[PDB]
């Protein structure tokens, strides 16, 4: 089964110019993200090749959702795992204001307004991790079955913790399209920074951007 307790432990086990600071922190969190994934139930039992495919497919959305939830109490800014607050004025003045505002409006503010807890965040990240549409998986059905168990557990958790909010489970799932769209746009920026070549991109972040 897929108990939300274990998913919550995985989140708590990994708790801690602007473009350069964000790219450096991203490389640091990629190491932490592997440790998180190995604590998600049944992920390590998957074929090694598929664990790679899932992490290469979801790392961007997984880590974007992480810092978004970490930034709840931050006003008009985000909090990186290194402890650095990046304010939206800094992002605008570095040329990435539009996508930064998208994170604040579509992700951080929505997480703040509903008070998304760390169990719901973990389940949402687990759903993203267990992405059955990832190309090249040796068995898409197994990953789809794992995703179904996660959101069967998360719905039951929502209905128990927040009985007064019937649409809350659906509200959580309906932030994934925004997360998908924002992840893709952030990838486009990274590839541009790489192309220009004056932004420090460390080895692990660089490996995520290379071809399969």
């Amino acid at each position: 089964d897929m108990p939300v307790e274990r998913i919550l432990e995985a989140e708590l086990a990994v708790e801690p110019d602007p473009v350069t600071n964000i790219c450096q922190a991203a490389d640091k969190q990629l190491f932490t993200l592997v440790e998180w994934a190995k604590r998600i139930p049944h992920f390590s039992e998957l074929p090694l090749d598929d664990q790679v495919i899932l992490l290469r497919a979801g790392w961007n959305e997984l880590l974007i959702a992480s810092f978004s939830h970490r930034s709840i109490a931050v006003k008009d800014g985000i909090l990186l795992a290194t402890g650095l607050h990046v304010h939206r004025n800094s992002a605008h003045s570095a040329g990435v204001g539009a996508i930064f505002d998208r994170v604040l409006t579509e992700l951080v503010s929505k997480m703040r307004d509903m008070q998304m807890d760390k169990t719901e965040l973990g389940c949402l990240r687990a759903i993203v991790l267990f992405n059955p549409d990832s190309k090249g998986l040796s068995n898409p059905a197994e990953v789809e079955a794992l995703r179904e168990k996660v959101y069967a557990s998360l719905e039951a958790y929502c209905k128990h913790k927040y009985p007064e909010q019937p649409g809350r489970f659906a509200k959580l799932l309906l932030r994934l399209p925004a997360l998908r769209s924002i992840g893709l746009k952030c990838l486009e920026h990274l590839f541009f920074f790489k192309l220009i070549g004056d932004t420090p991109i460390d080895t692990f972040l660089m490996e995520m951007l290379e071809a399969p």
Binding site: L55, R56, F204, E207
Partner: peptide
Amino acid sequence: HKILHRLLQD
């Protein structure tokens, strides 16, 4: 992908 394989092997 050297790094990801090595960390998942542990």
